[PDB]
């Protein structure tokens, strides 16, 4: 809410100032198993999926 739009603007960004919308966050996921014999050994990768 707030801002009037109206025939107004070329700019994409001034509107992006707030589209409303939503922002970033982190989350922690699951425990881990070692591939072999130690977990400190193993390393992580996550592609988005």
């Amino acid at each position: 809410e707030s801002f009037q739009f109206s025939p107004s603007y070329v700019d994409v960004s001034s509107i992006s100032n707030f589209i409303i919308g939503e922002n970033e966050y982190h989350e922690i996921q699951g425990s881990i198993q070692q591939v072999c014999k130690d977990i400190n050994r193993v390393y992580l990768m996550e592609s988005e999926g």
Binding site: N17, F18, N23, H26, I28
Partner: protein, 332 residues
């Protein structure tokens, strides 16, 4: 001239530490403190006592003072540790009642979701944020400095000029209002589930979780998400530096009808006792700590256990079918 002159301080944490310890010390049966809370003195302080402005005489501590307080005592009630909680003063974002709802000072701790105007997010209990950084423009507590940063470079308090736009949000570890823009930054702590809010929380004081009770659920307190690097932690109260414990107790007429009867002038004064021992028919018999929740003062041994804290009030009148509640807090 003084040769050696040195400086030393106790951290506010040590206040907390005592508490957490003190919390540990209430026992079930054995070798850890047990607590009874007592009221008495139907007797009137003085004819004035009713009138406005009357202040009952300031209590006296002595083997004499004990006896007297021990003399009139109407009734006694035990305390379970689960009625003991750590608490910090509640402060809500946007709350009209209290000053500057929109103006926060560094390290202040702000509750969210507490109230409709406060509430950003439905389907979640109360939130607890601390406010790390405040708008740059403002005023310094030290009158000499007009810059926040300079005020703080010396360490004097700073009050920011610009009010908060929005109550803080996000689980996110840093995450007050950093990117788009604001003067305030907000630190997240944990979220409080509603039932406890409702049952524990006094709008002045949120109730703060125990590390132990936390060990049970990090999630129900919303703390499970984070990052500690010490492993399990749960020592959260350290981070918030709560120095204040809340005793909660519940008086009911039924345990002590005699002081409850119509026409009682009520009890003037209150007293708490720790680790009293039961009455015994034979003085050579071994002492017994007190399990049951209430004892007529008779069923308790004379003077057994130590009473730390004595109290005198204008008369308060208990009444049957009334249910009266007492809270006492402590900053160690």
């Amino acid at each position: 001239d003084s040769s050696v002159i040195y400086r030393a301080i106790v951290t506010s944490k040590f206040r907390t530490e005592k508490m957490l310890n003190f919390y540990n010390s209430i026992g079930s049966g054995p070798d850890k403190n047990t607590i009874f809370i007592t009221f008495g003195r139907s007797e009137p302080w003085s004819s004035n006592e009713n009138e406005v402005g009357f202040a009952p005489p300031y209590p006296t501590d002595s083997v004499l003072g004990v006896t007297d307080m021990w003399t009139h005592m109407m009734g006694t009630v035990k305390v379970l540790p689960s009625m003991l909680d750590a608490v910090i003063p509640r402060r809500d974002w946007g709350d009209t009642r209290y000053p500057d709802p929109y103006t926060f000072r560094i390290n202040d701790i702000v509750v969210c979701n507490s109230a409709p105007y406060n509430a950003t997010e439905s389907g979640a209990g109360w939130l607890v944020y601390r406010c790390l950084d405040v708008p740059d423009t403002g005023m310094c507590s030290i009158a000499s400095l007009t810059d926040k940063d300079e005020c703080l470079k010396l360490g004097g308090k700073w009050t920011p000029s610009a009010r908060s736009m929005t109550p803080p949000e996000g689980r996110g570890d840093a995450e007050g209002t950093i990117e788009p823009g604001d003067g305030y930054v907000w630190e997240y702590l944990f979220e409080i589930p509603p039932d406890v809010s409702i049952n524990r929380c006094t709008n002045e004081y949120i109730v703060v979780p125990w590390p132990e009770e936390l060990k049970e659920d990090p999630t129900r307190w919303g703390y499970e998400d984070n990052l500690t690097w010490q492993q399990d932690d749960f020592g959260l109260i350290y981070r918030v530096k709560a120095n204040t414990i809340r005793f909660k107790a519940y008086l009911d007429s039924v345990y002590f009808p005699e002081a409850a009867l119509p026409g009682n002038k009520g009890f003037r004064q209150i007293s708490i006792i720790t680790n009293p021992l039961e009455a015994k028919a034979h003085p050579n018999d071994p002492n017994v700590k007190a399990e049951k929740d209430y004892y007529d003062p008779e069923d308790l041994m004379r003077h057994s256990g130590e009473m730390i804290y004595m109290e005198n009030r204008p008369p308060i009148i208990m009444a049957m079918d009334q249910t009266e509640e007492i809270n006492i807090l402590f900053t160690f």
